[PDB]
Amino acid sequence: NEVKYLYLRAVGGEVGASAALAPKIGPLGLSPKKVGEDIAKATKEFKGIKVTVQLKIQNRQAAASVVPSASSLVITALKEPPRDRKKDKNVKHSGNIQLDEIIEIARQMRDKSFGRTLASVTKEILGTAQSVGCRVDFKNPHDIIEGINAGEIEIPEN
Amino acid sequence: IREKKAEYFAKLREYLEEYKSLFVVGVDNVSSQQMHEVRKELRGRAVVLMGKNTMVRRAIRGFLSDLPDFEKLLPFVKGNVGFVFTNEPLTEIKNVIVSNRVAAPARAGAVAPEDIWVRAVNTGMEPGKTSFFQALGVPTKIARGTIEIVSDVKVVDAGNKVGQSEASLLNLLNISPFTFGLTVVQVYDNGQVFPSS
RNA sequence: UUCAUCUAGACAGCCGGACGGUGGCCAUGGAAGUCGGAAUCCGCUAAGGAGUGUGUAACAACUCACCGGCCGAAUGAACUA
């Protein structure tokens, strides 16, 4: 067995195009159709929002593994109707994600992160949400981060 | 400027009267992921404070009045060196510090960490790179379209900065011997410094 | 003349790095810190800008700001005549 590693940025729960699948995977004797279907299955919850999908090619099995992306996870929690490219381009996002949810994403992302504290990882994910530009608990992630820094949002550090 | 000067001085003071022992860690040739990872491993156990030699020297000279020990630490902070404060067993702190070492590739004009040889093995490339092989005068024959170095050659070693030629040779050889990592010059402990060794 | 930087190391040069999350999101035909659009996000920070630019279809990759090491005491800018 050979330990191979390959990912992409195919859009979540949207069948991946063979023109964007074959060049990467096609060489190493692996079905692009299988890759796309597995990506969609793993992004069932992620449908519409693009997600990075690690593939461990251990002797030619297209076993997709969605790696948690902070921003995309934030949008999945934002719960906006799956982005309809057809109806309008560049669909904006305004999700009301609760502090509990942003903390949850922080716990699900700390694993591969570098934030000193759980509070630090929450600030990171909140900065990602700020980049997205949505309003969060009827407030901007910037002011939520400043509140955490100034010791207002008591974080459940567990 | 003076405000952040005082802030840095205060942080050094805090560590100096909050951590029983410290190590003098050299960060030469060391990337940023290195000391990030080292801090991650040391989290809780040790803290890392690195900075400007003159900065730390002046801070130490200004703390001399209250701490009459550190005049012996003054002559040890030279080059890219900082201080890893801790209250934990020196040995394990040291190995955790010196363990995280990333095998970076052999780059041009980069002092070789160790005696990089060209150890004979069926490397698997072609006359295009045999050009470089001959350029550095290593007898190499095209074995079934896969080069083999007949004779080992002492190309580079500790120091003797790796010229573009050797750098390219080792890159095509796909060897990353430049396992950069934070070193340790000396060890301060309860007002007593001793070498790492 | 006025305003600044500066032995708590000023400018120049050389050398080493210049991050994790993160190839960030959005997309751009293709952008991978940088044709690109909003914010210049958090952490680690000496430093690192979702980056300073280059390069590439994109890359891979460099490079600069930036930070260190050396160096040793001056330096920069706008003005006046």
Chain A CB contacts of B43 under 8 Å are 116
Question: Is the Cβ–Cβ distance between B105 and B170 less than 8 Å?
Answer: yes
Sign of the CA dihedral A68, A74, A75, A78? positive
The three-class DSSP label of residue B188 is strand
Q: Give the closest residue to A106 by CA, choosing from A91, A121, A126, A120.
A: A121
Q: Tell me how far apart the alpha carbons of residues A77 and A137 are, in angstroms, rounded to a whole number.
A: 13
Q: Tell me how far apart the alpha carbons of residues A78 and A102 are, in angstroms, rounded to a whole number.
A: 10
| Residue matched to tokens 């600030």 | A123
Chain A CB contacts of B46 under 8 Å are none
Q: Tell me how far apart the alpha carbons of residues B118 and B132 are, in angstroms, rounded to a whole number.
A: 13
Question: Is the Cβ–Cβ distance between B130 and B140 less than 8 Å?
Answer: yes
CB burial of A46-69 (b: ≥16 within 10 Å; e: otherwise) equals: bebbbbebebebeeeebebebeeb
Beta strands at B102-104 and B140-143: parallel, antiparallel or unpaired: unpaired
Closest-CA residue in chain B for A113? Answer: B40
Q: Tell me how far apart the alpha carbons of residues B186 and B148 are, in angstroms, rounded to a whole number.
A: 43
Q: Tell me how far apart the alpha carbons of residues B142 and B104 are, in angstroms, rounded to a whole number.
A: 28
| Residue matched to tokens 């979540």 | A12
Question: Is the Cβ–Cβ distance between A29 and A60 less than 8 Å?
Answer: yes
Minimal CA separation from B156 to chain A, in Å: 32
The three-class DSSP label of residue B184 is strand
Question: Is the Cβ–Cβ distance between A68 and A109 less than 8 Å?
Answer: yes
DSSP H/E element including A54: strand A53-58
**From the CA of B184, how many Å to the C1' of C25?**
41
Beta strands at A3-6 and B178-180: parallel, antiparallel or unpaired: unpaired
**From the CA of B66, how many Å to the C1' of C7?**
24
Structure-block tokens of residue A149: 């820094």
Sign of the CA dihedral A45, A47, A50, A54? positive
- The alpha helices in chain A, defined as continuous H runs, are 22-25, 32-42, 70-78, 99-109, 118-132, 141-149
Beta-carbon contacts of residue B136 (< 8 Å; ≥ 6 apart): B153, B155, B165, B166, B169
Quick one: resolution in A?
A: 2.0
Residues of B with CB under 8 A from a CB of A: 36, 40, 43
Q: Tell me how far apart the alpha carbons of residues A153 and B4 are, in angstroms, rounded to a whole number.
A: 28
Sheet with B21-26: strands ordered across: B46-49, B81-86, B21-26, B183-189, B192-195
Q: Tell me how far apart the alpha carbons of residues B160 and B186 are, in angstroms, rounded to a whole number.
A: 25
* Structural determination approach: cryo-EM
* Helical packing angle, A118-132 and A99-109, nearest 10°: 110
**Which residues 98-127 of A have a C-beta within 8 angstroms of B?**
114, 116
Strand C bases contacted by the protein (CB, 7 Å): 5-9, 15-27, 38-39, 41-48, 50, 62, 67-70
Phi, psi of B158 (to 5 degrees): -50, 125
